Design a protein around this nucleic acid. Structure first.
Ligand SMILES: Nc1ncnc2c1ncn2[C@@H]1O[C@H](COP(=O)(O)OP(=O)(O)OP(=O)(O)O)[C@@H](O)[C@H]1O
Ligand SMILES: [Zn+2]
Length: 689
RNA sequence: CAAGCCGAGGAGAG
RNA sequence: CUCUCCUCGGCUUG
């Protein structure tokens, strides 16, 4: 309802037209000033007898409900009609109609793009930008190459150039809306010079039709008093040890390579070796040669184990391998449980190579003489704070992978010292259904946030989900364990730690360039402000000229892209799908069908009598509903499916291999859209009637 | 709650 | 340009 002094000046030009960007630091009441500007805009459009509608755009799902509950509704409930949309309600259905009411909309973005392209592609109702008078945005800095709402802004700019060309031609120029982007920092877009950074800023300002940036400069002391930074801090460690376990694994890896007669020309325990392994597997599968592809699939697991060894305990890698080989033995026993039994030489050699050393590795792993350095350093770092703050002790840990989060949470649950000091901990990751891990769900996320704000969990171990959006309580001891993405995540994490005696820690090893990257991002942070100062003081006419040039280039860079996007044959049955582990036939292209033009499936008894089902583990931690399919060899293929009560089994194209009938350039595809040919829709005329 | 499709961005390494 | 990791969004079957 009321404004601050430093918010007043930064908001001021927006109050009379003047589409702009606003970059303030974190936590300066960005949402609140957005709210004031909404209220002023609507009251103004009322006093002039003009229709007024505001739409807010966000990138995530939770920010919509967040802002609907905390900021917009509690202040605007009395004067105006408010609503909040996402893909997690039922209000998505009549989007063209809610616009006819509800002067204040909050929304996830791609709703709007879907409605626009429905208006411009089909005969649906749809909507256009003309039905609005203001678009407020969160997190401007995502406006880049073919992102979510660069699309929208490309259409806005297309219509603006239409209006500008028409100004000289006709009088009736459509009234375009006003645009108010909000952010924390637009961020330099990967540029090695101050000038290229300036260029990137101007590209953003073009893609938002802005007029200025309006950083706070004048009423600055009030900001420093109300708002403060943490202290940057580095904690490095090193190792000159860990021979017994590492070498105990390298021996195995060398044995396998010398069993395969392959030359890596690389090092064990890095990423180039992994890349080599992947391409070797793909080549061996395109050829069909076993004894080299499966050993590659195993060496990948060993390399991953070594990689996590550099950051995590030996026991976690041992558990990884244990789960893997246990699953494999279970697969082989499920296969041989039916009908005579033949064994392979390769898998036999590998299992005999592993299980003989399994107890050895379990003994070597448990050895606190040389556990790891970084873990101990963060032990010191954590215990310092949690002894200092005494029950006002909130916390965040950031890391790279998901599995690291589970391991760290388990570890903190085990070791008594953390529980003694009141270190209640919990993990957190994102919902993408990929990456060989069971993701979490939005509900568990929200619950964890609410427990954090309550204080049931003192510290949150997280992946990069946290270094934006969702509103975590002010913290003290944000750290960074093996992750440096860019300046944006850096500054956003650096904006979390309020509650004085806050920090910003970075934990790395010696022989992995990371502090390098930290310092690079620090300099980029110091550079973008200089560029901002260079452009704020730029001449207006030169600014206008430059943004016009950039808008033109951005619209022409779309058109060129469009031609290649639109430009694809149709072969009904010119392929055969084989198993990828075992060079064995599975299916032809004709047997396959599609449901809802998305899910691929087969419904011939021949394919029904060529696989075995097992029990789901994701649903084991109940009754299984979506079984996991396997081959007679052991390779997982797909997943069950329940369409119209029929238990017709789906499948993937990541686990199979293609053979064309002509000349056998066998290929791997990793997903269905990449290949050119089309499959037919499903119909019950086959198998029935 | 499980399963799958499509699109986008960031980082590394090559 | 490729591989991997991380995140997000929209949409289907159950
Ligand atoms: N003008 C204001 N006067 C008083 N308190 C304010 C004002 N603006 C914001 N706040 C307070 O700040 C809290 C949230 O605002 P804050 O800016 O810290 O988070 P935010 O808006 O999400 O910032 P960011 O999006 O950058 O994290 C609210 O609880 C509110 O009480
Ligand atoms: Zn097989």
């Amino acid at each position: 309802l009321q404004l601050r002094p430093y918010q007043m000046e930064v908001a001021q030009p927006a109050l009379d037209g003047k589409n702009i960007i606003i970059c303030l630091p974190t936590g300066s009441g960005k949402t609140r000033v957005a709210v004031y500007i909404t209220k002023d805009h609507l009251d103004k459009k009322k006093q002039a007898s003009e229709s007024g509608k505001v739409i807010v755009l966000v990138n995530k799902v939770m920010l919509a409900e967040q802002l609907f509950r905390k900021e917009f509704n509690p202040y605007l409930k009395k004067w105006y009609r408010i609503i909040g949309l996402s893909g997690d309600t039922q209000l998505k259905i009549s989007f063209p109609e809610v616009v006819k009411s509800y002067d204040v909309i909050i929304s996830t973005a791609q709703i709007l793009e879907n409605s626009l392209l429905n208006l411009e592609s089909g005969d649906d109702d749809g909507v256009q930008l003309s039905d609005f008078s203001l678009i407020i945005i969160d997190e401007c800095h995502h406006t880049n190459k073919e992102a979510v709402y660069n699309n929208i802004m490309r259409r806005y700019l297309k219509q603006k150039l239409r209006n500008n060309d028409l100004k000289k031609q006709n009088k009736p120029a459509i009234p375009l809306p006003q645009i108010l982007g909000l952010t924390a920092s637009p961020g330099v877009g990967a540029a090695k010079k101050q000038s290229e950074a300036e260029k990137h800023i101007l590209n953003i300002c073009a893609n938002l039709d802005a007029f200025t940036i309006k950083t706070v400069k004048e009423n600055l002391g009030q900001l420093k008093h109300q708002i403060k930074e943490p202290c940057k801090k580095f904690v490095i460690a090193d190792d000159t040890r860990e021979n017994p376990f590492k070498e105990k694994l390298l021996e195995i890896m060398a044995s396998i390579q010398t069993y395969c007669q392959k030359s890596p020309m690389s090092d064990f325990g890095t990423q180039h070796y992994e890349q080599w392994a992947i391409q070797m597997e793909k080549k061996a599968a395109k050829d069909g040669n076993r004894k080299d592809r499966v050993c590659a699939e195993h060496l990948r697991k060993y390399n991953e184990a070594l990689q996590i060894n550099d950051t995590i305990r030996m026991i976690d890698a041992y558990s990884h391998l244990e789960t893997f080989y246990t699953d494999e033995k279970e697969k082989k026993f499920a296969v041989l449980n039916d009908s005579s039994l033949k064994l392979d030489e390769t898998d036999e050699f590998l299992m005999n190579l592993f299980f003989d050393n399994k107890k050895m590795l379990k003994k070597l792993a448990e050895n606190p003489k040389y556990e790891n350095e970084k873990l101990i350093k963060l032990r010191n770092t954590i215990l310092e704070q949690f002894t200092r703050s005494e029950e006002s002790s909130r916390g965040i840990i950031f890391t790279k992978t998901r599995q690291s989060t589970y391991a760290l949470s388990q570890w903190i649950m085990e070791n008594a010292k953390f529980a003694e000091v009141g270190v209640k901990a919990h993990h957190l990751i994102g919902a993408g259904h990929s990456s060989e891990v069971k993701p979490m769900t939005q509900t568990e996320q929200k619950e964890v946030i609410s427990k954090f704000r309550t204080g049931e969990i003192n510290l949150l171990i997280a992946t990069t989900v946290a270094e934006e959006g969702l509103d975590i309580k002010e913290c003290n001891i944000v750290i960074r364990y093996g992750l440096v993405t860019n300046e944006i995540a850096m500054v956003q994490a650096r904006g979390r730690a309020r509650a004085d005696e806050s920090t910003y820690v970075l934990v790395t090893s010696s022989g992995s360039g990371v502090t390098e990257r930290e310092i690079v991002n620090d300099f980029r942070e110091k550079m973008m402000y200089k560029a901002i100062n260079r452009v704020q003081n730029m001449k207006p006419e030169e600014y206008a000229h430059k943004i016009l040039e950039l808008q033109v280039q951005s619209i022409l860079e779309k058109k060129m892209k469009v031609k290649r996007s639109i430009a694809y044959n149709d072969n009904p049955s010119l392929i055969t799908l084989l198993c990828k582990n075992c060079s064995m036939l599975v299916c032809s292209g004709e047997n396959i069908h599609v449901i809802e033009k998305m899910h691929h499936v087969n419904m011939t008894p021949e394919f029904k009598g060529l696989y075995i089902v097992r029990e789901n583990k994701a649903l084991q931690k109940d009754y299984q509903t979506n079984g996991e399919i396997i081959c007679k060899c052991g390779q997982a293929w797909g997943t069950m499916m329940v369409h119209k009560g029929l238990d017709l089994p789906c499948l993937k194209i990541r686990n199979f291999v293609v053979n064309f009938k002509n000349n056998s350039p066998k290929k791997q595809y990793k997903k269905w859209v990449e290949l050119p040919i089309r499959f037919p829709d499903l119909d019950y005329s086959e198998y029935c009637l």
